[PDB]
Amino acid sequence: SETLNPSARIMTFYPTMEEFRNFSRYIAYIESQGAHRAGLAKVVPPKEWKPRASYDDIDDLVIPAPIQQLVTGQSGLFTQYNIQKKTMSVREFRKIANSDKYCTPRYSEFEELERKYWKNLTFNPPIYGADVNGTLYEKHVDEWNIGRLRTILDLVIEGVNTPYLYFGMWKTSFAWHTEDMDLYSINYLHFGEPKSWYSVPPEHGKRLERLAKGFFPGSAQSCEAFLRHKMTLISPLMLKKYGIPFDKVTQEAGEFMITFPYGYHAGFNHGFNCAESTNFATRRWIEYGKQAVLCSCRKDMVKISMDVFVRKFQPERYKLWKAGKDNTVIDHTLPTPEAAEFLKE
């Protein structure tokens, strides 16, 4: 397993229609190939598959709580604050996103747009139409249906077992984080301009945390898991300066990204777009869930009770865990047990 994907580079996968039909089996397959070591993987669906016939009929969809992303900082180190804005429609959002004030700058190569993002992060705070309860999948679509993946997570939270829509514009950001309870996530870009991602391998996540704590000493003092506030922006130049391994990938319309337990990621939208996401689990997640370091400083943070998971999937350790003496050590290289059928017996 420490043999497979030794560089922990982001892998891209092109399932056949037949493989694509079985969601959890395909996740086990990509873990059999080492995809989880990166923390992020791209899955390009078969060209004939579409979750919806068209996106011409959603201009009246409501975005109840858009947020305006205020950013403060310099020299690759920033804090993002969310300002709640008034309810709006998709139509109204698209209008703003494509206006002269907020639209994507002219550029040639990706590297130029990336430079502009990091130069212009603190100016012209954009509006992100984030965390909208809903789905854009037609009700007949049974493949990779983010509204009903039917993983073991269903034994249990909005956006967490439920689908959320995210309407982006240029320069809207997602800060460095892992998922709630160190879950997996899935993200489909339904339409529009790209989304760019950065990732750090799970095996290096503790290294990122230590660097972050040193860069943001005040936030670290007041919370054990301050990165879960989703307010900390760190440029790739700053990671490179302190030897944190990372990778980058651009997700285009019609592509999925999978994030893996304890996979730190961040990134930004290129322009007007719409993405759908939720969390999911495999059997390997349960150990992550049990060991996830949670935000100590806010009430109403997502906290899942692991009890139901430990009783069912780990009966031999239940009494030991319930007493606080389960000291299992996670190996980030190991694929989930479901991957067995794709590995030498």
Identify whether 177 is a catalytic site residue: yes
Q: Determine the interface stretch with Zn ion among 53-61, 126-134, 155-163, 291-299 (rule: CB under 5 A).
A: 291-299
What is the sign of the dihedral through the CA atoms of 328, 331, 334 and 336? positive
Instruction: Pick out the residues of the known binding site for Zn(2+).
Output: 223, 229, 295, 297
Strands (E), 161-272: 164-168, 173-177, 184-192, 195-200, 232-234, 247-251, 256-259, 264-269
Alpha-carbon distance of 18 to 222, in angstroms, equals 49
Q: How far is the CB of 224 from Zn ion (least distance, A)?
A: 7
SS3 string, 18-63, reads HHHCCHHHHHHHHHHCCHHHHCEEEECCCCCCCCCCCCCCCCCCEE
Identify whether 36 is a catalytic site residue: no
Between 103 and 297, whose beta carbon lies closer to Zn ion?
297
Between 10 and 183, whose beta carbon lies closer to Zn ion?
183
Asked if 297 is part of the footprint of Zn ion (rule: CB under 5 A), the reply reads yes
> Which tokens go with 271?
């322009």
End-to-end alpha carbon distance in the chain? 14
Between 41 and 227, whose beta carbon lies closer to Zn ion?
227
Asked if 295 is part of the footprint of Zn ion (rule: CB under 5 A), the reply reads yes
Q: How far is the CB of 309 from Zn ion (least distance, A)?
A: 24
Alpha-carbon distance of 112 to 107, in angstroms, equals 6
Instruction: Pick out the residues of the known binding site for Fe cation.
Output: 177, 179, 265
Q: How far is the CB of 228 from Zn ion (least distance, A)?
A: 6
Identify whether 277 is a catalytic site residue: yes
Instruction: Pick out the residues of the known binding site for 2-oxoglutarate.
Output: 128, 187, 195, 230
> Which tokens go with 63?
């975005």
Which residue of the set 114, 271, 277, 288 is catalytic?
277
Q: Which of 220, 223, 320, 334 binds Zn ion (CB under 5 A)?
A: 223
CA 46 to centroid of chain Cα atoms: 22
Which residue of the set 29, 36, 177, 262 is catalytic?
177
Which residue of the set 166, 184, 198, 262 is catalytic?
166
Q: Where on the chain is the footprint of Zn ion (CB under 5 A)?
A: 223, 295, 297
Q: Which residues are catalytic?
A: 159, 166, 177, 179, 265, 277
